[PDB]
Amino acid sequence: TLNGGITDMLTELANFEKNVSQAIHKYNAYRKAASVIAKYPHKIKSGAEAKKLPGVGTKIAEKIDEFLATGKLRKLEKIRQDDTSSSINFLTRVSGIGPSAARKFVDEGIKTLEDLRKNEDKLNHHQRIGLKYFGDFEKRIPREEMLQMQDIVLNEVKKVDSEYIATVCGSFRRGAESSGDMDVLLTHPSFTSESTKQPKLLHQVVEQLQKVHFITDTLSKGETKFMGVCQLPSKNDEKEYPHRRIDIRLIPKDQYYCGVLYFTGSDIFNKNMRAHALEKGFTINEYTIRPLGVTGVAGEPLPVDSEKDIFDYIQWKYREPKDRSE
DNA sequence: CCGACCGCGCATCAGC
DNA sequence: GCTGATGCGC
């Protein structure tokens, strides 16, 4: 929060480009700037000072001067005054409603929460759940609750099969004192890059968690990726906990490190690392790290036995989870 | 300049 | 039914 004013501005600008302009590269350009500045250990005094940092160009330097000088940005002031922009930005806050759907709904006259509610018929399954838990999904999850949730998930998983290994990643693994959701990496010895000796591996876990009333809804579900809703159990007479978003990813056992790396994030950290990888002649995905042949085509997976091996391949000093929050 | 911007699972759709 | 592109999200 040392430069909280500036970073909030950039993020607001990032959201505008993504949601309203549908300019994904401008979106990421603003995010990178916000990130590098959030990490800057000095209270910024000028755009020029800011331009020294990588990711901050001329355009953003100018905006920072305006912000430092007036405490606001006219460009944003107008965006906030624009009804269409405001409506699209809001609608995209519903899980399942993206830039396209948001703009389309506004085109039909659906611009508010009230509107969405009386038009459920026009929403797909995911969007319907996103609306239902609109309020809840906006709430943060205290680490204390993340710990209780972890306990439930690991123990329930263990009940299904002692050989499953469930790892909580995302901001939680990065040591965050609060998280936006719960991210679970799952592995079973019967599922490897070599073969799938047992079907319904993810299903079983999902089913067990639904049985105990932990998982309450499903946004989407496939063979290796579950995306849904969960809720901690409340005691007698106490208000129940808010519903939380939960993602579960089943990854081949032998590809755990690339998997835990990917799911630990952050998303921006992953983008930076994968980009750096390319520059170093490698391509990284949640399964493997492969070299780039002279042609520019990925080669065979390289041997990995720790998160650090991945960092070594691209000549990056290892960075603990707590330091990957970009 | 100007091309590149990480990589991929699931839901949905049009076209065959 | 299938494949492929697109939307959305992680």
Place this chain on the structure above:
DNA sequence: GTCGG
């Protein structure tokens, strides 16, 4: 919107 070659 920003970067490198």
